[PDB]
Amino acid sequence: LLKKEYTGITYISGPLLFVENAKDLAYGAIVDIKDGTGRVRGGQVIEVSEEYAVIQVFEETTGLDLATTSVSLVEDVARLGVSKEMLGRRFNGIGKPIDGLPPITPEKRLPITGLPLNPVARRKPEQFIQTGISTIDVMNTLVRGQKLPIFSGSGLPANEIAAQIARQATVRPDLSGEGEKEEPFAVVFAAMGITQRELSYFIQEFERTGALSRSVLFLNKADDPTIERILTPRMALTVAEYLAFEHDYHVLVILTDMTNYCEALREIGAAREEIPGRRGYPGYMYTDLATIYERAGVVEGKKGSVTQIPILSMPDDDRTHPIPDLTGYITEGQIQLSRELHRKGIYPPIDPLPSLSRLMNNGVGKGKTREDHKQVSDQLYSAYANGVDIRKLVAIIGEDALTENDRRYLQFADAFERFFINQGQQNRSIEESLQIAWALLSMLPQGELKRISKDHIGKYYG
Amino acid sequence: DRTHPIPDLTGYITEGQIQLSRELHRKGIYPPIDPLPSLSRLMNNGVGKGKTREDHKQVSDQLYSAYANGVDIRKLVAIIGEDALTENDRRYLQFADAFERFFINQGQQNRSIEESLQIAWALLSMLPQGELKRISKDHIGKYYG
Amino acid sequence: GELLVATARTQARGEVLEEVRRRVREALEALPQKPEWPEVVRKLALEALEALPGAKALVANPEDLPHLEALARERGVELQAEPALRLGVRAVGAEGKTQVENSLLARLDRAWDALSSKVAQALW
Amino acid sequence: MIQGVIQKIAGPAVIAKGMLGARMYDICKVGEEGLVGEIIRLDGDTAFVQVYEDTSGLKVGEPVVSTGLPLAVELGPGMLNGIYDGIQRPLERIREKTGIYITRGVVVHALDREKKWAWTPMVKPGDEVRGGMVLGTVPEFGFTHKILVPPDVRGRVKEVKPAGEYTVEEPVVVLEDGTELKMYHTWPVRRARPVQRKLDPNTPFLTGMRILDVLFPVAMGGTAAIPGPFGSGKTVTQQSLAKWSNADVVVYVGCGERGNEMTDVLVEFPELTDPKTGGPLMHRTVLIANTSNMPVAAREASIYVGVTIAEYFRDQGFSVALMADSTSRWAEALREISSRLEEMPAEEGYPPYLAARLAAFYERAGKVITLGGEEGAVTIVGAVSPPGGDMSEPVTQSTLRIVGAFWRLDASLAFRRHFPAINWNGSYSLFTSALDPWYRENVAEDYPELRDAISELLQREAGLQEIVQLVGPDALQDAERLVIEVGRIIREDFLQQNAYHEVDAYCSMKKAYGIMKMILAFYKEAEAAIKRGVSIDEILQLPVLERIGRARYVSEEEFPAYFEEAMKEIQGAFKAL
Amino acid sequence: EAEAKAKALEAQYRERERAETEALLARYRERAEAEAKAVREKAMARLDEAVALVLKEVLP
């Protein structure tokens, strides 16, 4: 393969550089930038005319000039050389191995931007997963092949909940009839602007629990240049689509802190003066978050799956910033860690009223988890919601003026929050979580529980 | 509101603030400086021995403590009844009223520094000595007449 | 310990391929002593000026500035010598700013990926 | 060497033409005076030099001379006890030569080229040297200031000058190549000093307060932020961190801040004593001042010069504490260089790479093992002055994703004069887990249980404060009410640090633990004594309670004799009711 | 005495898991160097045809 080298770079500012008299670069191609002291940087063509070509630059732009810096074409579509002997490695945000080991010998060259999966050829995500977190396994059920992120605040423990899920998430065949045959999870752990203090947590967690032999890590630390975050989720999802849909794995993708990704493309989309949505983020960001999140799910006819837990760090911990707003319009569920429950020392500080999982109703119920599962979930939301809006009434009229079957609500609420939500690093199975939910519902009088059918309210109450 | 850009961007560059108050103005008190939101970020230098009289910093401290305590108790006496309050709280209410009628409301006259300090001690003699915590007892002996 | 075995396997495999590739660079840089190479350099110059229409000049090592000269008069192109360019010859396009390199070193380091898959498959 | 002339002069930015070939982020002398500016936005054959100094009087046609290097600091011996301005030139020598005003374009060396330093080598000819290996040492003040090979340089030692006393510019170690090594080397500020690997922090940074080392600690390689509105301190706490720490050196960088701060630090520091070595407390601090009226483009680079000098003392194996003051004024400088450059902003004028720059600033912290093999750490405390109080800024949130401990100063709690104004609802700290081996080793065994009890009393008292405001505070039952009174004793005794007192401005872990034990013994025996049934109206005027409320006022050396007597007086006090 | 017996069980118990640890890890280490030597046995056994393959396909 020959190598063309264009020169005549007109303009270099910020992320962007130009090259005029350059016509034979494809749109979306990769370039490598070769400065005067002999150092390759990466780049990607984002606009081509017959005159010029605009390149965005992955590494930092210091040290470039205009009488050197040749631009050489590579990979007219952006590819990743994917292999299966790839499940013990670390990588940085371009795919270059950063553990000292040799580069991998590519079985395939997949295109990094993916292709949209065919909505006939999907399969409805059926099979239950359990996480050992009772709020998740009961009220916001995760099923396999599902997008649901974790909305969290500034300084909540979200990395610990994601590592806890990936430590103990197993699929139960005792309740479904599949047969054991137990395949555990490959983990594709993508990370965008983690500092060191969270990276050391995840690496110590994985090397303890024995997961670095099944996980491929795509680390983009926060001192690496801030545009290769645009490649990193696509790297991780191309690897996940490979390992799931062509080798029958059951892949779990942890996409750390999408707020850093979304700021990484606000930066690029405001080097181009592209007209924004709200609070500066560009008009097309929904399509980018869509092209990341919707590369998940199961396939009809295959055994693979991709299950995504993205993480969000909601800026002023609200659901109205454009990043949680759009992220909940794409995916199917979210779980919101609440700041208020965290200050009570409660771990995992989920609160159920602003969290949900849309694929609960597929995978819970008789024959597949237990027949009373969905109604228990309904009644817990009803009772705890009534307890919270009677706390808002305690907040003016004082504790004394509450009657009865009101104080049992008010005691249901905090007994709930400190016996059901609060748990340490323990793994509670679904029988444990359901019998604790019946224990908590036993406090209410039997005639109050109006969303539970009478046979289930008979054979479990008390 | 202090969060307007001119109050806060002055408040970052300067060395304290002296804040006039709306509510003290409507009571005919003049100059209507209330002493609770105000402070000098300096004034540890410009007080004390030689530069002022000796007992200056402690008197200023004790006025701020006693007037803060009196204004808290006349916030609370608006809520609870005006008799359900113990013995020292009556002297704190009488101190806050005597303070803002005699110390602040000076009107027109050009008070010297010792006239201000002897009005300060004249208002502090409305309190028992065990209620005067910050002033070390030598100044209590010399002054407090 | 299974990680230890796996890392031993991957590093020994990688040292095998790097040994293969160093031998390949050795055979490439031992081509230009063996007289089949000026029969070769014209082919890559040929494909270079194929893909680069309007190619103003050719720049090469003076190993084959005396050689290609009569083999490029009919090319209508100017020839110059700027050595340190072994095993190939590159085509300066229209008034600078665009140039096409073809050379055995660059062909190796840009074909090495698909050749690594196929070579590892033929080797193991 | 690429030389051109000025084309346009738009405010504090100068657009020079004729400069084909000058690299980006170089440093180019603009003007006929020789001002210092910096290339961004190459375009055609044209630079975009932001000048650091003010720019009144430049005509068109004056030369612009590139130097072909990015912004480099000089690192070597002679920096401590030093006030440097933003571009690292010593202000005391500016006052020697210029006058008492900072004029435009004075050229002095950051390290004095005349000073005699004793050299004592540690290598032989033929010894290999690599990046970051120590060569010999220089005694500076109370330090074994050890010089070190620049982090790019490898090779073998050909010849070493023997032990004498020399100058900073003296070529002392010659390699086997023709590479000289003097006692200083220059480093580009926008690049990290490399490390071998980065340890995770397990060791507290004893800030010397009583709330910020007990309730919200911060480890040694840690990052912490102090956001606060005006008039809520935020500078008295930065100075109490400057004085009363356990850092070995302290790089106090003020960028865009009151000038009286810096002259307080220059006047009152050389008559203090660091409680680690003796000697003046000014002998360990390097302070980089860029006062608010000094030019606004240099307070971008002031932060980077500070973090590079702290990394150099990191690589010598110290525990450095960098304190950036008003990173929000740094972000304002990024705004004013961005809108000058005509960009499209996002979220209140700030350029959208704000979190990229601020994140790569805070990332340079941490506890590492240096390339010489000896370990060392640099902690970073950043002051944030958000505009209207209003912690929903871009600067506050962008730093809030990445800093590890967060200290919210409330200005409502500093308008009734409660100092330090650290709120304990809103402020958090994520290093509280990893320090518990250190606590259970070196302060107590039950110290985590003890400060957990104190934080639970504060949460109970603050959640009960609402009904305290709602209905009568005498109209609550008394065992409930005792939580209110012990909450009062906590927040007027344990969190009430004076910082102008001569012995309350530093409280070690033993004395913090002693005051905690007094308050919890009082609480436990008064709770049990009211379970017995006594008078809460009588429980308060005990004279042991003033003995508690002034237990923060006795010295660190006369404390345990005070402490054990007060503990016995607790039990002796609650017998007799 | 039940506590003392628990501590003695714990001490010999530590020794048990540590001996198992060291023997198994050094076992896996020497099997690792044997596997490395196995693929280096394969290495020069076929290397000339691979060099010939790439040295045909990289040449024009």
Ligand SMILES: Nc1ncnc2c1ncn2[C@@H]1O[C@H](COP(=O)(O)OP(=O)(O)O)[C@@H](O)[C@H]1O
């Ligand atoms: N020089 C430039 N650098 C970066 N972005 C640009 C530049 N010029 C235009 N853009 C952005 O890209 C878009 C270009 O659209 P336009 O040029 O009209 O048609 P086309 O889609 O064919 O390029 C504009 O909306 C603008 O936001």
